[PDB]
Write a protein that binds this ligand. Structure first.
Ligand SMILES: Cc1cc2nc3c(=O)[nH]c(=O)nc-3n(C[C@H](O)[C@H](O)[C@H](O)COP(=O)(O)OP(=O)(O)OC[C@H]3O[C@@H](n4cnc5c(N)ncnc54)[C@H](O)[C@@H]3O)c2cc1C
Ligand SMILES: O=C1O/C(=C\c2cccc3ccccc23)C(O)=C1c1ccc(Cl)cc1
Length: 341
């Protein structure tokens, strides 16, 4: 019925039975019961910057546009209650304008605020769990409100409880953020290490990060994409050691649990996949992990190319990449790994 092309950054042109913009929590709950009473599946979307529509969605797509930014003062920090429909970068830009630093490393990350805790948005040595106080959700079937604390969200690398037992039944309506008044700059990543720690300000980091991302990362407006198509593979300590014996120059960081996060873009580049094209789908020439809609790409083309990238990295390194972009079937979420396997 209705084209989803304007509602996803990848530029995939599939149809949805019905599309509605929810301005508040109750309108989202109302749109749920109706579609659910009609026997339709319901998909809660934000800005669509990390979704891959595989085919026509045979249901209702509720676009979360719940606005609001409340500020609460405590002696040692600022507490922000932000609506799920708020643009993330606009919020990051707003907080720095009001003199509330903390989100400057997460600048220019696309998508809404409601989607930020789902895969714990992270960039330049900072993740959302660092500043997340809580996340508000409504049980879609009943309309009952639930406030999960930062600990209850079970944040990990591109992972949270909203990708598991809170995935299907719940819709995020608000996100709580704690910004410490005693600001501590995170400058241990890339070209931010070249900033002077003694004189660095939140705005200098924000402007630096925005310039780094604009010049280096692929823009969906030039060629449609959903950021990094694959996650940076988090492998075991022994698996990382065996790989580093053969490939000692492989970029890697040790994790809290003792696992090892390997660079996906590096592994893909080492297989000579830059510029590889399956139809309209293409691997970007700078950021190899970013798949792009180069020329009227089918959703099959992207899945076909993603499989080919996964297989070549798998045969060379014995490391099997998992998609960070979420795959949407005809009736809702599907296993992205099983689709590319
Ligand atoms: C150029 C580019 C760069 C990117 N860089 C990064 C980066 O550096 N770091 C990073 O972590 N991510 C990055 N991303 C991915 C993206 O910014 C995030 O994953 C973001 O959280 C998605 O927000 P969205 O509103 O667009 O979500 P959508 O794509 O609309 O939705 C994503 C998923 O979350 C679900 N969802 C959305 N809202 C709700 C809700 N209210 N309740 C329940 N489920 C919901 C959807 O059902 C879907 O399954 C990038 C993307 C692009 C295109
Ligand atoms: O360019 C990147 O390097 C990333 C991660 C790493 C960078 C440098 C060293 C690393 C070492 C180990 C693991 C990851 C990285 C990354 O995560 C992106 C990225 C993020 C978003 C988009 Cl859209 C494109 C690329």
């Amino acid at each position: 019925n209705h084209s989803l092309k304007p509602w996803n950054t990848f530029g995939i042109d599939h149809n949805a039975q019905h599309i509605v913009c929810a301005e508040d929590e109750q309108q989202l709950l109302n749109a749920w019961q109706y579609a659910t009473a009609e026997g339709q599946p319901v998909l809660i979307l934000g800005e669509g910057s990390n979704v891959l529509f595989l085919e026509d969605y045979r249901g209702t797509v509720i676009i979360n546009r719940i606005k609001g930014i409340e500020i609460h003062d405590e002696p040692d920090a600022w507490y922000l209650h932000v609506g799920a429909g708020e643009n993330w970068h606009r919020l990051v830009k707003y907080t720095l304008q009001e003199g509330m630093p903390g989100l400057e490393n997460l600048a220019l990350i696309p998508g809404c605020v409601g989607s930020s805790p789902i895969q714990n948005i992270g960039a330049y040595g900072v993740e959302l769990q660092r500043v997340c106080a809580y996340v508000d959700s409504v049980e879609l079937a009943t309309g009952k409100q639930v406030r999960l604390t930062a600990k209850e969200c079970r944040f990990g690398y591109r992972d949270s409880i909203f990708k598991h037992e809170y995935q299907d039944r719940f819709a995020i309506v608000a996100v709580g953020l704690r910004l410490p008044k005693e600001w501590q700059p995170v400058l241990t990543y890339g070209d931010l290490t070249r900033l002077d720690p003694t004189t660095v300000t939140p705005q200098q980091v924000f402007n630096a990060v925005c310039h780094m991302r604009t010049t280096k990362l692929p823009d969906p407006k030039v060629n449609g994409n959903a950021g990094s198509f694959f996650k940076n593979p988090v492998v075991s300590a022994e698996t990382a050691k065996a790989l580093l014996s053969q490939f000692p120059t492989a970029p890697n960081y040790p994790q809290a649990d003792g696992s090892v996060k390997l660079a996906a873009g590096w592994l893909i580049d080492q297989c000579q996949l830059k510029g590889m094209q399956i139809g309209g789908a293409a691997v970007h020439r700078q950021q190899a992990l970013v798949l792009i809609n180069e020329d009227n790409a089918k959703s099959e083309d992207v899945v076909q190319l993603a499989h080919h990238v996964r297989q070549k990295v798998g045969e060379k390194f014995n490391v099997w990449l998992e998609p960070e972009v979420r795959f949407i079937g005809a009736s809702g979420e599907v296993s992205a790994v099983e689709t590319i396997s």
